[PDB]
Amino acid sequence: HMLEAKFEEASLFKRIIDGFKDYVQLVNFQCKEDGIIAQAVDDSRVLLVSLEIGVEAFQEYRCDHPVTLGMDLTSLSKILRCGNNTDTLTLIADNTPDSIILLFEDTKKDRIAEYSLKLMDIDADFLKIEELQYDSTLSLPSSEFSKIVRDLSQLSDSINIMITKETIKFVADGDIGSGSVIIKPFVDMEHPETSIKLEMDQPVDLTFGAKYLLDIIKGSSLSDRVGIRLSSEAPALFQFDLKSGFLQFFLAPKF
Numbered sequence: 001h002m003l004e005a006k007f008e009e010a011s012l013f014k015r016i017i018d019g020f021k022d023y024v025q026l027v028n029f030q031c032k033e034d035g036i037i038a039q040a041v042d043d044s045r046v047l048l049v050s051l052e053i054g055v056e057a058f059q060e061y062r063c064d065h066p067v068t069l070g071m072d073l074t075s076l077s078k079i080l081r082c083g084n085n086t087d088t089l090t091l092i093a094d095n096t097p098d099s100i101i102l103l104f105e106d107t108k109k110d111r112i113a114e115y116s117l118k119l120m121d122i123d124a125d126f127l128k129i130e131e132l133q134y135d136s137t138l139s140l141p142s143s144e145f146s147k148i149v150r151d152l153s154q155l156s157d158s159i160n161i162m163i164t165k166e167t168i169k170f171v172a173d174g175d176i177g178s179g180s181v182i183i184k185p186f187v188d189m190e191h192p193e194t195s196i197k198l199e200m201d202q203p204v205d206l207t208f209g210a211k212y213l214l215d216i217i218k219g220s221s222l223s224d225r226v227g228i229r230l231s232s233e234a235p236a237l238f239q240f241d242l243k244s245g246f247l248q249f250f251l252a253p254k255f
Helices: 010-020 073-080 142-152 210-222
Strands: 003-007 026-032 035-040 047-054 058-063 067-072 087-093 099-106 112-118 136-141 158-164 167-173 178-183 197-200 204-209 225-230 236-242 245-251
Touching: 003 010, 010 047, 010 073, 010 087, 010 210, 010 245, 047 210, 047 236, 067 073, 073 112, 136 142, 142 167, 142 178, 142 210, 142 225, 158 197, 158 210, 158 225, 204 210, 210 225, 210 236, 210 245
Parallel strands: none
Antiparallel strands: 003 058, 003 087, 026 035, 026 067, 035 047, 047 245, 087 099, 099 112, 136 197, 136 225, 158 167, 158 204, 167 178, 225 236, 236 245
16 A cells, blocks of 8 residues: 555544535645645636645555545545544555545444545646745634624625734625624633734735635634735735644635
8 A cells, every 4th residue: 555644533634625625626635755735726716725734644644655646525525424533534545546545444343434436637736835924914713713704704795804003804895784893912821722813014904705715714623723814915825724734725815
């Protein structure tokens, strides 16, 4: 077995796939000695999803040679929904593979579910995320960010994120009515995951497609917190941190 990736948590690969599947259905997953990366972006080039899973996210990880797993995520998620979470999930691939193997094993129950998925040929042209500075860097609980997006999206196809000194303001205005949610940087010491953190180098007022924010918050299951980095000259970066790695959404604002 050239590739043998045993997830620490079976739910993790399932929750990772959730960040991708409803946006771009066919995604190339590249495996290397140092772990797994994946990117997805449609023709509009407006939203880019970028994953990185490091070795430490696995119980055992081994990848002899670089492998690209071209996967239809619709199929992959059906199969992944066959797992129990009380299951260990092992990805198994061989030299120049036609198929990926998913090996669900039940602890102490003597059950082995082995699934195989035929791989697809996908032209994944990669982009090294060119690293830049952001005008504002923000972080809040992911479930809080999610409720904000879900709500304002009831009112508009556009959601505005406005950063001024010590103020984060999410705004939407549509036909039925308007919505506004303002949050202030708090530092909770008893419970730091609930903290609201803000660093503003320059104020920003960016407007985003609500469909894309709705795509992004599909990553909320992956991390207690989402990091938002905003730019008046480049895409915003919405990131969910993994134990080893991240799911990044790069989103281009509107005019």
